[PDB]
Amino acid sequence: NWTEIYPGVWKATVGKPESYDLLKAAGAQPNKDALSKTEKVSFPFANGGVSLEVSGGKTYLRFPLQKEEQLYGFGLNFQTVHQRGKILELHVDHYGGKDSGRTHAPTPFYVSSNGYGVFINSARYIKVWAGTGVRKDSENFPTPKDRNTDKTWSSRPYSDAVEILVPAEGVEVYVFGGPKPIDAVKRYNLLNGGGYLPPRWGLGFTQRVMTRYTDKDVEKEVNDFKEKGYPLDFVGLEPGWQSKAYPGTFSWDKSRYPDPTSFVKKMKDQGIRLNLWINPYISPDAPFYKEIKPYTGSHTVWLGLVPDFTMAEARKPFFNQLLKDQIERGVSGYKIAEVDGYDYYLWPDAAKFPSGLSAEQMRQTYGLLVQRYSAELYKQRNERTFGLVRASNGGGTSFPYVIYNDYYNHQDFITALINSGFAGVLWTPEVRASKSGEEWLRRFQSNVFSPMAMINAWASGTKPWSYPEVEADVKKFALLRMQMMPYWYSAFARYHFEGMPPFRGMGLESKEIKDQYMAGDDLLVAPMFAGEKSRKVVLPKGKWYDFYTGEYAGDGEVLDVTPGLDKIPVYVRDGGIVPMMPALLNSPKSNQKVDLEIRYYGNKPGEFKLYDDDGETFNYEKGDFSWRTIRVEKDKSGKVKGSISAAVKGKVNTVGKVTFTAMTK
Amino acid sequence: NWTEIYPGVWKATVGKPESYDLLKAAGAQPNKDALSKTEKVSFPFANGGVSLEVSGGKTYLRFPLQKEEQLYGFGLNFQTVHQRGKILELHVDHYGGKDSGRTHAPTPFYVSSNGYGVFINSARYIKVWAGTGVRKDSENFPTPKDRNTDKTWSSRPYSDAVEILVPAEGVEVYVFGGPKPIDAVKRYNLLNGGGYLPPRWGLGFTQRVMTRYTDKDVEKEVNDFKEKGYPLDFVGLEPGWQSKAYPGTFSWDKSRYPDPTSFVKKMKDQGIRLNLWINPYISPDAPFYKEIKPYTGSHTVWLGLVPDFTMAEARKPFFNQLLKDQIERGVSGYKIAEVDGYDYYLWPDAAKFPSGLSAEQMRQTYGLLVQRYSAELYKQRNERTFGLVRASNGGGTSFPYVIYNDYYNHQDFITALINSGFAGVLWTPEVRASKSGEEWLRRFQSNVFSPMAMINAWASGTKPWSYPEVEADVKKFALLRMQMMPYWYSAFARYHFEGMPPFRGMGLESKEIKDQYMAGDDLLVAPMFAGEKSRKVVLPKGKWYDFYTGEYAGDGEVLDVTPGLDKIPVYVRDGGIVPMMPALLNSPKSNQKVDLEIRYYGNKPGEFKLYDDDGETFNYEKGDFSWRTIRVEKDKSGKVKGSISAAVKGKVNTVGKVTFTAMTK
């Protein structure tokens, strides 16, 4: 039976749940306060058809579907957005080129167009039939037809239920009420703790450099950025920062980084944080190898031992080493690779772990474990982090990590960004290389409208300027990313405080939209792909305005758009507001005031809540943050008229001079 | 611990095995007598490294591998023959375009080049890592390398073990000794009962006709075959023989087959047997619908009920209906479709069956069940059958069925034929349609060198003569199939009596051979594909001769061959013998004597064992069969000299006049 545990959140325990699961792995704390503030709504299945039962060692779940109903979610899918009629086995893996359920974050959470959601809190591989099964006892069992004579015969008859098989003696299930699909998503995310509140520097530009770069090489690239006037907040170091990689020593290479404490200080003195690549596989030359060895799994990954991070005795030496040798030198964060797959790189399910945990549950949660305990080191020091991870799952909403991968299909990169908002994780459509300046710029354009503005040059050695044809436009989009920082910061604050995903699909305020996404509350983004001169944009009801010129674009209609190579199609909702700081090269400090131009689109009176705090510590948890309310409209004369609410006594205030601009002439 | 249960056959029971499994599903009886006649050999794992254990609800198996070792098997794979370094989940399904373990017969049996085999007798889905896992405690654990500096670093380090995970509390495991790989295969097959001994008519030509054909349409096609001088033994009827299909009534359509008893008699009077399409999904208009309904599963397939055939109460009305309405009218056999997949057509694993059997074990064994109980009806009447099935598994060696499917890649069709000999099942690379006469003939050529000589015209309406460009050559290969009948019959007898697969890969007397196969003992077949003028043939050591001219071809060497459109490359081993009957249009009757020309290749003295019995009943089980030994060589003058052993008193004797021909001038 379903206990209403929070407004719009119901929990059922079926059979005997396992003692390890996703929420537990994650150490995921609900945001009770934000949840308590959501509307009481009624239980979304009001007319029966729900079945929860255990049999033959397994838990069988069934939830009914109505005829109108579309489904979204089941994790970070790359080619599909509509999920009804799909069959999946949710299984952490590097993406393999089709949507089978094998993916970086195979979140067992789905959302319906009728405005509810369902989360299956198991760390096993989970099978889903999302409306494919046709039951003989169904109330909607179609009438048998004779294929020999009836041309209306169907190869895929109507199915009226989502079916889920969990390989265990019981499971915890959570149901999220609406009224709208986005509501279900927000409560799910809040149940997970809300999204991480990133530091401002996390929303700036990151350049990752080639594997082999020395300290001098990095110092030079930093100078080139500065000299060329390109923004940069943090640099990614790749495997050659370690004395050995694959497997790793988790200790600085003496040859390429002869003085780490000094190298890290110098970068920081220039405004540059560092983010370090790791996979968590242990070299014999690692300083804690012998200590940790008995707390590792039976099977290795690239000949490195696999720590059982569910054990204090594995956690302590691993993370103490990151703490003492890097974090305490000033390293800002980490890039966690190769905790996903493929099956032939990672441990088999047949592997055994010292804690007794199944290899399967370890596979499903390893990314979560590494996220969790690394994030903790930073929190302990009252310091925010932000970085990258190649696997996550249900339970992982609150972690300071963005998913990336080694796939590269650009269209699919955008589909993944859309599905990220249904999956309780962040994704970045990263930039690495390109066969043309056109492709370079299109990729860079979509990437600055995402969680993380990044070129990953580990193998390519590219820099933002590497394609001379498009170099001026790349710079402009790099500077835009900085200007838009207050817009992104406030979007991310809503992720944290209300569970609102900052990037999500259409219709979350009839056929599938896989190539447009909302970015914050106000912007509809419709990327161009290389080799296209034009594309269609499907605008929702209500009026929309061109992001660049402020001109009316349309209202509930399809547009044909020929944007040119120098623009990514972006439209602003009527009364939409985008606060813009100056084109700074470095994210501003907490003791620093910054001027804002409020860009106001359309004529509908507009309202925007600007988030503000020190941008780097956990002081916000003690209440040291503000929401500055911004209102803009045009008066009688058609002249812009705007207000910003007053700064709050005793709070951080980074808001400088505020001016208002009516974009729609 | 391993009980030697037969010569070269060892059995281990690990933990608590489930009460249902493949051998049990199949009702598979070992051929004790044939097994007792195999060499005692020693247990193939003599130096440890074997691990069998139960943990967390699952059975973990490990078998060691040596450095030299290659692996074969894990079922009916279509693109791969070498299996070492593969990862699979064995799962009955229609083939989906890659070798993942999803396939028609995912036999959990593998064979090593060191000359042993292993069979995992579980009817669950089984995960296999065939030498991918790298264990930290392995005696062959490679030395960690630094990817930053060592260019010899490996992304897939050396693995020294086959690992298998079974989702159950225990399993029965079988190990088969050698000395050679083919030995392990023969014992496995004999453990399963040996292969079926087919009727002679089963090795003739079968034409399946369009779905909609009436009795008159079939009668006409039979006349066209006769009038055009093309051979034909049995005709396949497709779904429009039933009053309804998808789901089925299992009862003759009154409109298309107004008088079934008469229609079946007339065909038989002309030498033509009938083979009827079924899927086993039950229409409401079936005469036993209500009776059977309570013994069907929760979920339907194309709106038809799924009988739980593990229950007498489901079996009785289903098979009584086949018996009374078709078999007793004279129907010779059945074509069993759609017992494989895909997942979105068949029942989900979440489905429930009245017997309590998991939907998973039902999925894994359904084909076996339908094969088993249908075969029984025929055996009960002292009558052999032969037909088609779209799924089988371990346990299914002795059933009178050949696997076929709806895939069509010709190269892959040949790879499947090779892998059939490692999988304990029969496969036919069937002919349906083609975009050219060239493709038609190449397909027809490979198909007459397989278990079943067949055109499946259910949708295409093709006949052997449908491509005028190649029509004369097609006829010749159709007549060859008849001439070669004693060669094929004797090959199939060895399948039954000794477990020797009649079609199998190379090296079963260094890199992968996916496009050549042995057909009986004597013939190496190397098919051409459409658009090729020439191909390489890799000949094993020892001398080989051209099947058409008898000329020396080579010895342990690669040939470049430009055969022409009118020949499929076939080579005969030195001293090889192919007995040829006349080009009859119909398989000969049991009371009928037939002349044979013994075609003898090379100069090495040759010996062939010709099988002989009534070709249609189970009298052979009472000892009414003979092996006629045939010896041929050339004398001093280079003149052919041959003998055939004398017919045995009281036995069937269909051998007429025997003459000998030395093919190698």
Ligand SMILES: O=[N+]([O-])c1ccc(O[C@H]2O[C@H](CO)[C@H](O)[C@H](O)[C@H]2O)cc1
């Ligand atoms: O060629 N490979 O086997 C291979 C392995 C790993 C790859 O990617 C990842 O690690 C890189 C550093 O070695 C880099 O950080 C990348 O972003 C990771 O996904 C690529 C190719």
Ligand SMILES: O=[N+]([O-])c1ccc(O[C@H]2O[C@H](CO)[C@H](O)[C@H](O)[C@H]2O)cc1
């Ligand atoms: O278009 N389809 O959904 C479809 C279904 C089944 C197909 O193949 C099988 O059944 C046929 C008769 O309907 C025929 O016997 C064939 O050999 C079977 O595999 C093909 C297409």
